[PDB]
Amino acid sequence: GEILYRWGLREKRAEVLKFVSCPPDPHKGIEFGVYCSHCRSEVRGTQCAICKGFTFQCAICHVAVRGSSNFCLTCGHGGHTSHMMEWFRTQEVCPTGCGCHCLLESTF
Amino acid sequence: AVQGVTVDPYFHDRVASFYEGQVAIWDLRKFEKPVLTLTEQPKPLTKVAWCPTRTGLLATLTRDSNIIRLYDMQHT
Amino acid sequence: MFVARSIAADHKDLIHDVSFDFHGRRMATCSSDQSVKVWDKSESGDWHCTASWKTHSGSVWRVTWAHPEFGQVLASCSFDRTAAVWEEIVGGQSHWVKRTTLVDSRTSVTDVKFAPKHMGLMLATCSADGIVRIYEAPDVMNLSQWSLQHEISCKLSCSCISWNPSSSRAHSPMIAVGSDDSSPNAMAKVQIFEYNENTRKYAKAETLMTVTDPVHDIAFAPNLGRSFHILAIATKDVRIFTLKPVRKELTSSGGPTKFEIHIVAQFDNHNSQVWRVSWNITGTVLASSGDDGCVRLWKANYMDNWKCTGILKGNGSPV
Amino acid sequence: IEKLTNEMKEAGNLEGILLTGLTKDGVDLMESYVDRTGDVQTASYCMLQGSPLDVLKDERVQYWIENYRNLLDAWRFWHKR
Numbered sequence: 001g002e003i004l005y006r007w008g009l010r011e012k013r014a015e016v017l018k019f020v021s022c023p024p025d026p027h028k029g030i031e032f033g034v035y036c037s038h039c040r041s042e043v044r045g046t047q048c049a050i051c052k053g054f055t056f057q058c059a060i061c062h063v064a065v066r067g068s069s070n071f072c073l074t075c076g077h078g079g080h081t082s083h084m085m086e087w088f089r090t091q092e093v094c095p096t097g098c099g100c101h102c103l104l105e106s107t108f
Numbered sequence: 109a110v111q112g113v114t115v116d117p118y119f120h121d122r123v124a125s126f127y128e129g130q131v132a133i134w135d136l137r138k139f140e141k142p143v144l145t146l147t148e149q150p151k152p153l154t155k156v157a158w159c160p161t162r163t164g165l166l167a168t169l170t171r172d173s174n175i176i177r178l179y180d181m182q183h184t
Numbered sequence: 185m186f187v188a189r190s191i192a193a194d195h196k197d198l199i200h201d202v203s204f205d206f207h208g209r210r211m212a213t214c215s216s217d218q219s220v221k222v223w224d225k226s227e228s229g230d231w232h233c234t235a236s237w238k239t240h241s242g243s244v245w246r247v248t249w250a251h252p253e254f255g256q257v258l259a260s261c262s263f264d265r266t267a268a269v270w271e272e273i274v275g276g277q278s279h280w281v282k283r284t285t286l287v288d289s290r291t292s293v294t295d296v297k298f299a300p301k302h303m304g305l306m307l308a309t310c311s312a313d314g315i316v317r318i319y320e321a322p323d324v325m326n327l328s329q330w331s332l333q334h335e336i337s338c339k340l341s342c343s344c345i346s347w348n349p350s351s352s353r354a355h356s357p358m359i360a361v362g363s364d365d366s367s368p369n370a371m372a373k374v375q376i377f378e379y380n381e382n383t384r385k386y387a388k389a390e391t392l393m394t395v396t397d398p399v400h401d402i403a404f405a406p407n408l409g410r411s412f413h414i415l416a417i418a419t420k421d422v423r424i425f426t427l428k429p430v431r432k433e434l435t436s437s438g439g440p441t442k443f444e445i446h447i448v449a450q451f452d453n454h455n456s457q458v459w460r461v462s463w464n465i466t467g468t469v470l471a472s473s474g475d476d477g478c479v480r481l482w483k484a485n486y487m488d489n490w491k492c493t494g495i496l497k498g499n500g501s502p503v
Numbered sequence: 504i505e506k507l508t509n510e511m512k513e514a515g516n517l518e519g520i521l522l523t524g525l526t527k528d529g530v531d532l533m534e535s536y537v538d539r540t541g542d543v544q545t546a547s548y549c550m551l552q553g554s555p556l557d558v559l560k561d562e563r564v565q566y567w568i569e570n571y572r573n574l575l576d577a578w579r580f581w582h583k584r
C-alpha cells in the first residue's frame with residue numbers, strides 16, 4: 001500500500017488496505033456535532049436523543065440528511081453534497097441568506 | 109326459516125334461509141344453529157339470491173319495495 | 185377546460201385505492217387480490233413498477249403515504265382488523281419491509297390516515313364499531329414501536345376520517361369523522377373533535393345537524409392562510425361547508441371553540457351516491473366521483489360562486 | 504376618505520393600499536384579498552417592500568410566507584426558494 005501511494009495511485013491503496021485483518025484507530029481530536037432542528041440541543045448523531053428526530057436538514061431540499069454532507073465552518077450552514085455542489089456551481093453566497101461567502105471562508 | 113334455501117357458488121358450505129322479514133345463514137359443516145341473522149325488515153321478504161360473478165355478495169328484495177338490499181358476507 | 189389521457193400502466197386485478205407521494209413522483213396502488221404495487225415516474229415521464237407484495241389475509245381497503253421528512257413510509261388498512269406500516273429498505277433493488285401492525289380494533293379497520301407534519305408522526309384509524317384510535321411513535325428512528333395515544337367512541341359506524349391541515353399557532357388540532365349508517369331515524373352523521381390543551385383530551389365540538397343521509401367521504405381543504413375552514417362531504421349530493429371560529433373572550437378560556445356553520449355549495453349533478461371527493465394542493469378545485477361513472481371538477485368564480493368546470497367519464501371519453 | 508377606506512377593506516381590492524398604506528389596515532385588506540383569491544405570492548412580495556419591523560411582526564404575514572415557501576418546495580423549485 002505504501003508503494004502504491006508513492007506511485008501516485010490512491011484508490012488501489014484503499015482497495016488493498018480493505019483486506020487488512022487489523023483495523024485502525026479512530027481520529028482523536030476535533031469532531032463535529034449538529035444542533036437539533038427541533039430541540040436545538042447538542043446531539044452527536046444523525047438522530048436526536050431528546051426529540052428522537054433528525055437533527056440535520058439540508059439547506060436546499062429541506063430533507064433529512066443521513067450520508068455525505070458539506071457545510072461552511074464560518075456560517076454553520078450546509079447540507080447534501082450533490083445539492084450544495086449544484087448550488088455553488090453558479091452561485092457564491094450562502095444559500096440560507098446568512099450573507100457568508102462560504103467558498104472564500106472555507107477553501108483555506 | 110325454511111324458505112328460499114340457496115348455496116353460495118363460491119362457498120359450497122354456506123346456505124341461506126328466510127322466514128317472514130328475518131333472514132338467517134347456516135354453515136353446513138356445523139349446521140346446528142344459524143351462523144348469523146340479518147336485520148329483520150318491516151315488509152316480508154320476497155327473494156334472496158347470491159351473486160355468481162362476485163364472491164360473498166347476497167341480494168334481498170322484500171314486498172312492495174323499490175330498493176334491493178345487498179349484504180357482503182365476504183368478511184369471514 | 186380539462187383534457188384526459190390514459191397512462192400506460194398494466195394491472196391484472198381491480199384497483200381499489202390509489203395514492204400519491206408528497207412530490208407527486210411515487211404512486212401506491214391497492215388491488216383486489218390483497219396486493220400492493222409501487223410505481224415511480226422516470227425523468228422522461230414514464231411510469232414503472234418497483235415493488236409488489238401481499239399484505240393481509242382480508243381485503244385491503246386504503247393505503248396512504250407519509251411525509252418524506254420521516255422517510256418512505258406507507259400505511260395500509262385491512263378488512264382483517266389490522267393496520268400495517270411498511271418502510272422501504274434498499275441495498276439497488278427496493279425491499280419493502282413491514283415494521284409494525286396494529287390489531288387493537290375489534291371490527292374491520294375501515295379507514296387509516298396520517299396526521300399533519302407539524303404534529304409529529306401520528307396516525308389515526310377509524311373502525312366499523314365506531315372507534316377512532318390515534319397512535320403516536322415517540323421515536324422517529326424506531327418504526328417498530330407505537331403507543332395508543334387517544335381513543336374515541338362515536339356511537340355510530342365510522343366510515344371516513346379527515347384531519348385539519350391547518351398549521352397555524354392559533355388552531356387546535358381537529359379531526360372530522362363521518363358515518364355510513366342507514367338507520368331510518370334522522371340522526372347526525374358528521375361530528376368534529378377538537379383537542380384541548382388544558383385537558384390533553386379530544387372533545388366533540390360541532391355536529392352537522394343538516395346532514396342525515398349516509399356519508400361516504402369527508403375531506404378538509406388545504407388552509408393556505410385563510411381565516412376559516414372548508415369541508416367537503418360526499419352523499420347523494422355533494423356538499424360544501426365553511427366553518428369560521430368566533431372571537432374567544434379574554435375573560436375566560438373554556439371548552440371547545442364556537443364556530444359558525446354555513447353551506448356555500450350543494451351540487452346534485454351526479455344524480456347518484458357520490459363516492460369520492462378530493463382537493464387540489466391550493467384548496468381551490470374540488471374533484472368528485474359518483475356512481476354515474478363520471479368525474480366532476482368544480483371551482484369558484486369571479487362572484488365567489490361555485491360552479492362546475494369539468495366533466496369526464498370513467499372510460500376517459502370526454503363528455 | 505374614511506367611508507371609502509372602510510368599503511375597500513370590506514371589499515378586498517388591492518387598490519385601497521394607497522389609502523391604508525402598509526399598516527394593520529393594509530394587513531386586513533391583504534387578508535381579505537387572500538380570502539377571495541388565495542394568492543399568497545403577491546401578498547408576500549408586497550408586504551416586504553419597506554414595511555416597518557412591527558408590521559412585519561404579524562403572525563399572518565409570516566404564515567403566508569411559510570405557505571409560499573412550502574408550496575415552492577412542493578414544486579422542486581429549490582433555487583427559487
Ligand SMILES: [Zn+2]
Binds near residue numbers: 039049052
Ligand atoms: Zn432534539
Ligand SMILES: [Zn+2]
Binds near residue numbers: 076098100102105
Ligand atoms: Zn458561511
Ligand SMILES: [Zn+2]
Binds near residue numbers: 072094098
Ligand atoms: Zn451560512
Ligand SMILES: [Zn+2]
Binds near residue numbers: 061
Ligand atoms: Zn440537500
